[PDB]
């Protein structure tokens, strides 16, 4: 479905400093994988936000749950060096 246009596809194509000539549908695959990654991190970060369900923010996720879901999991170990601010 035409939901994510070529504007953000060209936004995520000029961002790379040293990149080889990729195809026009591989960047579309990376954009579809990026929205599924953001959906997987949202669904897997409420698995660790349910560990602290004593208050009203149990259905609402936050940075402490995001930080521990990034440092515990092995498929999200590339994000703890970029969560530091």
């Amino acid at each position: 479905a035409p939901v994510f246009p070529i504007s953000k596809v060209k936004k995520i194509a000029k961002c790379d400093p040293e990149y080889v000539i990729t195809s026009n549908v591989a960047i579309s695959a990376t954009a579809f994988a990026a929205e599924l990654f953001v959906q997987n991190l949202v669904e897997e970060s409420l698995v660790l936000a349910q560990l602290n369900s004593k208050g009203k923010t149990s259905l609402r996720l936050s940075l402490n749950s995001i930080e521990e879901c990034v440092e515990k999991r092995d498929n999200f170990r590339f994000l703890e060096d970029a969560i530091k601010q």
Partner: protein, 771 residues
């Protein structure tokens, strides 16, 4: 007893093995807090933790509670024991990983051996055992009045003197590349514990794949050689799409030696059954299992089982194809709804799953078809056409010498496509729900000179068709000469590797009709009728598209023969890459006796050149090898007789793609390219066909018939002097009716031979025709 333990610690454990030495010498010592919270302290549990943190990455030194098991080396000279710790995981890792990370801790790049008796400190373990034997042996003995009992250790002065009567992405990319170099080393150390760290949470992207997987019609068998072997890439087909899954396949050898091999090897599965395979071998009174390590065959050397006499050679199941015959072509995981998601994520363990189903109606479908076919010749043709069912554009990579112009502008191709399309439009309207070639074609050539960049253009066009559909398509590769040479260019897709075309025919450069009228467009309309032929040939034989099926029809016979051998359990399968014997010792002198020099079928000379009467031959016997097994090792021959008796039953009143199995079963015995049996089967069927030739050379002699020739295709009959040629019809039916009875099965037809007053010396005389 301290001398026995000092002898086992003095000779560095040379009589002991390496696993008992690393379980004996090492020290289990876990931690309580993290590595970062132990700054400023120096101990052996902090040194092993720092070595695991810079050797196996930073992922295990994040959380607290690390179990740092260690050993102590000798090669750091005059250093403390708190900084001489080495983990046990450096000896379980690979050779250049341990050699790369050992020397940075050992501080010696001069070492060439990785033998554990040379690295570890025998003197630190000797002094810790010495202070324990010093206390409990030499400490209360000198005061009691007896001497030093152990002469290896000694006692000092205090008890001896009494005896006097964009920026930052470069750093991030190098950090992620070294981080994933340690994660692949973590998976190189063990292949299952890190794998279930992503599948511990059942997300809704694994559950959707688990709710959309039922009746997996498998399509192509594959390989994985750059990593763990024994795991197969399976392109199974779901109800609406095709899923690329992976299958874990074990190696079920028949060995019977698992009795006293329990502390020797690591026997996990405990199963004792009838693991006796009956093949002809050398020891007398022996007249005719599985594995827990699917990556390496660490088998036992010394054979003494005390159950039956005879060394088991390790007769195996076929390692690359033990799922297409033992399982099915239509795979089905019979279980609940929620375990198959873990099977999709890890890889399907088909040893405990993947049972068969009904094998009829394998492929009822509707999807796209890719079609790559190459045409090399002695002239430079190279017609690398790429037909696709959705794009309709074929791309020929032709015209290697670019000076002259000899290739058409698709005008002639379009006119012959129109005439061929009208005749095959009726033939295409028969098979149109599978392949739609019904639209009017339109295409463009690519006239190329180089070969390397032509393969680069070919790889760009196959990635173009693999990106235009992704999946839900089928690529039928059909190159004749370079069929196994086209497997280096493009891969990782489902492909019937088939030599359909024999060779491209030679042609003078003044026309192009034998290379374009029936070679290019007739092959894509034949590809439509050919995939319906393939649907029927894989619905009957029940094997996926891994077979040749037109050049070599010896694989379907092999899959059916392996299923017939798996129906029973006395006789088993054989070799896969060898010349395929069925003997007791594959690497021996047994096959020179079964070579059989010049292989004489028959050679008759009764010296009759001029025949006495006007006799006509109608004795043109075919299928004599088929009509030998249907009349007649022993169990392999009777299971072949039962398979051919069941095979002739479907080749009567209802047959479309199973009548070729009979003629391919005739051709299948004499060649080594055929699988699961050609060893003693060829010589035995040759002697039994020689016996059947000698039985049918005199049982048909109800009249005065004599022979002069016998070479399994035709013989000589002889009729009376009266009634020369008008009586052919009744003589032919009476000859067939008296020839069908003494052979007792009568499955060899005789049609239209020739004879009219012959002359025959031995081979150079053919005088006579009467048709």
């Amino acid at each position: 007893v301290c001398n026995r333990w000092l002898d086992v610690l003095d000779s560095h454990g040379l009589m002991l093995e390496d696993e008992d030495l690393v379980s004996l010498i090492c020290e289990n010592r876990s931690m309580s807090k993290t590595l970062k919270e132990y700054e400023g302290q120096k101990s052996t549990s902090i040194t092993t933790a720092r070595r695991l943190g810079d050797f196996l990455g930073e992922d295990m030194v994040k959380d607290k509670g690390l179990q740092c098991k260690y050993i102590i080396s000798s090669k750091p000279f005059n250093a403390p024991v708190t900084e001489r710790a080495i983990p046990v995981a450096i000896f379980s890792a690979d050779i250049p990983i341990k050699r790369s990370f050992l020397r940075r801790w050992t501080l010696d790049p001069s070492l060439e051996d990785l033998d554990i008796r040379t690295i570890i400190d025998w003197g630190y373990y000797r002094e810790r055992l010495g202070s324990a034997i010093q206390k409990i042996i030499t400490i209360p003995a000198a005061l009691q009045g007896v001497s030093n009992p152990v002469p290896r250790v000694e006692h000092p002065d205090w008890l001896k003197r009494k005896i006097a009567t964009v920026g930052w992405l470069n750093y991030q990319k190098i950090k992620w590349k070294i981080q994933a170099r340690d994660r692949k080393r973590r998976d190189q150390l063990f292949g299952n514990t890190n794998s279930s760290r992503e599948r511990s949470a059942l997300g809704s992207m694994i559950r959707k794949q688990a709710e959309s997987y039922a009746n997996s019609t498998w399509e192509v068998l594959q390989y994985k050689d750059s990593g763990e072997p024994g795991v197969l890439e399976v392109f199974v087909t779901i109800n609406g799409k095709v899923q690329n899954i992976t299958f874990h396949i074990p190696k079920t050898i028949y060995m019977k030696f698992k009795s006293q091999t329990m502390p020797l090897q690591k026997i996990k599965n405990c199963l004792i059954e009838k693991s006796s395979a009956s093949l002809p071998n050398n020891p007398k009174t022996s007249n005719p299992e599985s594995v827990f390590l699917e990556e390496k065959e660490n088998c036992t050397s010394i054979f003494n089982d005390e159950n039956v006499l005879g060394v088991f050679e390790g007769t195996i199941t076929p390692h690359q194809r033990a799922i297409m015959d033992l399982g099915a072509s239509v795979t089905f995981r019979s279980k609940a709804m929620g375990a198959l998601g873990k099977g999709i994520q890890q890889g399907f363990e088909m040893k405990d799953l993947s049972m068969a189903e009904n094998e009829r109606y394998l492929s009822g479908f509707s999807m796209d078809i890719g079609y790559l076919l190459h045409f090399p010749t002695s002239i430079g043709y190279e017609f690398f056409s790429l037909f696709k069912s959705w794009g309709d554009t074929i791309t020929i990579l032709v015209l290697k010498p670019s000076n002259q112009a000899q290739e058409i502008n698709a005008s002639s191709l379009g006119q012959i496509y129109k005439q061929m399309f009208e005749k095959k439009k009726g033939k295409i309207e028969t098979y149109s729900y599978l392949v739609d070639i019904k639209e009017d074609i339109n295409f463009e050539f690519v006239y190329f000179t180089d070969i390397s960049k032509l393969y680069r253009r070919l790889s760009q066009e196959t990635t173009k068709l693999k990106e235009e559909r992704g999946l839900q398509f089928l690529l039928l590769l059909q190159s004749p000469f370079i069929t196994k040479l086209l497997g280096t260019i493009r891969l990782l897709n489902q492909m019937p590797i088939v030599k359909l075309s024999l060779n491209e025919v030679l042609l003078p450069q003044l026309n192009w009709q034998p290379t374009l009228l029936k070679k290019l467009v007739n092959h894509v309309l034949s590809s439509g009728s050919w995939i319906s032929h393939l649907i029927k040939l894989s619905q009957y034989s029940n094997i996926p598209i891994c077979n040749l099926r037109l050049d070599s029809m010896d694989y379907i016979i092999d899959v059916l023969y392996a299923r017939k051998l798996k129906k029973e359990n006395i006789v088993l399968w054989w070799n896969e890459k060898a010349p395929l014997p069925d003997h007791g010792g594959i690497q021996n002198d047994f096959d020179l006796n079964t070579s059989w020099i010049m292989n004489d079928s028959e050679f008759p000379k009764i010296n009759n050149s001029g025949v006495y009467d006007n006799v006509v031959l109608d004795v043109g016997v075919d299928n004599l090898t088929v009509n030998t097994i249907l009349t007649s090792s022993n169990d392999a021959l009777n299971v072949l007789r039962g398979m051919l008796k069941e095979w002739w039953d479907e080749a009567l009143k209802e047959n479309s793609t199973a009548d070729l199995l009979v003629n391919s079963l005739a051709s299948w015995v004499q060649n080594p390219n055929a699988k699961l049996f050609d060893g003693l089967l060829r010589y035995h069927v040759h002697n039994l066909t020689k016996k059947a030739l000698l039985q049918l050379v005199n049982e048909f002699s109800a009249l005065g018939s004599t022979i002069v020739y016998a070479d399994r295709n035709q013989i000589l009959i002889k009729t009376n002097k009266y009634s020369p040629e008008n009586c052919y019809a009744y003589s032919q039916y009476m000859m067939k009716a008296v020839r069908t009875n003494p052979m007792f099965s009568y499955l060899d037809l005789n049609i239209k031979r020739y004879w009219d007053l012959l002359i025959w010396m031995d081979k150079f005389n053919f005088s006579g025709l009467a048709c």
